[PDB]
Amino acid sequence: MIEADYLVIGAGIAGASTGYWLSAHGRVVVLEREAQPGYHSTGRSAAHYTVAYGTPQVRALTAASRAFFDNPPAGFCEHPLLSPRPEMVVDFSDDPEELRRQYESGKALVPQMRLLDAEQACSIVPVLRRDKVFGATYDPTGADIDTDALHQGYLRGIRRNQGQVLCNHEALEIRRVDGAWEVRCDAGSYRAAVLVNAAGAWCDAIAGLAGVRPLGLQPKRRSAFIFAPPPGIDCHDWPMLVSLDESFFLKPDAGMLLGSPANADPVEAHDVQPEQLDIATGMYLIEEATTLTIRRPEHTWAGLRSFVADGDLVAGYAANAEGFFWVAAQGGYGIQTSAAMGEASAALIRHQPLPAHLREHGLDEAMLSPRRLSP
Numbered sequence: 001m002i003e004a005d006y007l008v009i010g011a012g013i014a015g016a017s018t019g020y021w022l023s024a025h026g027r028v029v030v031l032e033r034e035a036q037p038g039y040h041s042t043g044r045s046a047a048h049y050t051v052a053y054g055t056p057q058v059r060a061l062t063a064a065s066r067a068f069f070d071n072p073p074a075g076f077c078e079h080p081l082l083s084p085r086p087e088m089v090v091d092f093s094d095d096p097e098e099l100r101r102q103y104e105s106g107k108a109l110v111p112q113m114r115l116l117d118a119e120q121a122c123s124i125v126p127v128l129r130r131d132k133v134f135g136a137t138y139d140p141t142g143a144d145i146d147t148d149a150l151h152q153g154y155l156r157g158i159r160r161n162q163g164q165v166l167c168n169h170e171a172l173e174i175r176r177v178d179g180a181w182e183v184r185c186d187a188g189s190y191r192a193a194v195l196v197n198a199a200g201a202w203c204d205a206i207a208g209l210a211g212v213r214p215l216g217l218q219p220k221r222r223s224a225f226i227f228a229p230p231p232g233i234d235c236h237d238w239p240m241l242v243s244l245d246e247s248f249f250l251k252p253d254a255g256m257l258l259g260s261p262a263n264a265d266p267v268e269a270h271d272v273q274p275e276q277l278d279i280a281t282g283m284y285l286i287e288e289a290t291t292l293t294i295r296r297p298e299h300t301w302a303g304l305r306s307f308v309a310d311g312d313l314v315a316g317y318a319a320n321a322e323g324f325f326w327v328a329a330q331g332g333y334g335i336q337t338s339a340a341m342g343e344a345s346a347a348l349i350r351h352q353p354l355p356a357h358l359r360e361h362g363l364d365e366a367m368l369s370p371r372r373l374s375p
């Protein structure tokens, strides 16, 4: 039996970020089922940072995370965590009222947000079909996230604070014993006053092992693919491109193009694979909107974006389950919110007020709590 102050289940971006901030204050042990910590959703994202995306709570967590991403502590990483990647949201269906509403709502959080006419949008991504473009919003502050550097920065930070990150340690049994949580894996047993459930799409399965009422988390499949651009086209500086109704997105990635139908098909928690129909739909939508020809993609994959009913993230203690803390419902936003979520969850776990910079972004304990979910 190994004792810790905080026992975290899951070493994806959620468990890693929470563990990183916790590790300055006590012994953190993170238990990860897979042989590597980023095998599931944290290794499958589009790795983008967009403030004007998700619910108001999501947008506040994303905005509050920028300070850490742009100014991490010395030794956290060797190169910047963010690289510039503006986001351009294009109206392909002639809906100026919706385009206006998205512009006005986005500019309220991003003062530099711009409204583009169709000619400006086509100047920025010249493969757009001009006759299908009716305008666009443009966020000059968008960024791509170096998810490997960020994730490993969190994980290394735990280990440098005498914490442990244990892979090939699937939590198989969970029990409340003598005022602490005990977790049995095949390879060992672990004990801590606080159990941090950061198991991604599996968070409700973990609650199942513990006898704790679940949140109603719904994993949703999103597929993506990479394909070659035409040889005479330099797309490496293009913004992230999204349609106004999030029917698809397209962005440069490693000399290639990354496309997606931006789907959200409800599924059970599992090692999710792309569906041929997902890929064909993404290819059709991109070819409908642009002059690009997509041969069979060179690489396809899918990951899980997991939501509770209201679309907001969850960080708080369970009702009537002492020491059981949820870090869940990261949705499509777990990377870009990870710094605020990790710092906020660590404060809440320790029963401390949220730091001032987080409260200045409108964050509070109430908007993160799982107990807000009414059945």
Ligand SMILES: Cc1cc2c(nc3c(=O)[nH]c(=O)nc-3n2C[C@H](O)[C@H](O)[C@H](O)COP(=O)(O)OP(=O)(O)OC[C@H]2O[C@@H](n3cnc4c(N)ncnc43)[C@H](O)[C@@H]2O)c(O)c1C
Pocket (backbone or CB within 6 Å): 009, 010, 011, 012, 013, 014, 015, 031, 032, 033, 034, 037, 038, 039, 040, 041, 042, 043, 044, 045, 046, 047, 048, 049, 169, 170, 171, 172, 198, 199, 200, 201, 202, 206, 222, 223, 224, 260, 302, 303, 304, 305, 306, 330, 331, 332, 333, 334, 335, 336, 337
């Ligand atoms: C699929 C997908 C997701 C995107 C995408 N885009 C973005 C994006 O642009 N920006 C962003 O912030 N998030 C984006 N997301 C979302 C981001 O991927 C998720 O929000 C984020 O990765 C969720 O992080 P979590 O830590 O909550 O989930 P993980 O699956 O990474 O980690 C959970 C861990 O728990 C572990 N676990 C489960 N059961 C366990 C057990 N019994 N014992 C031990 N470990 C367990 C799992 O093995 C796993 O490693 C995207 O284009 C796609 C296609």
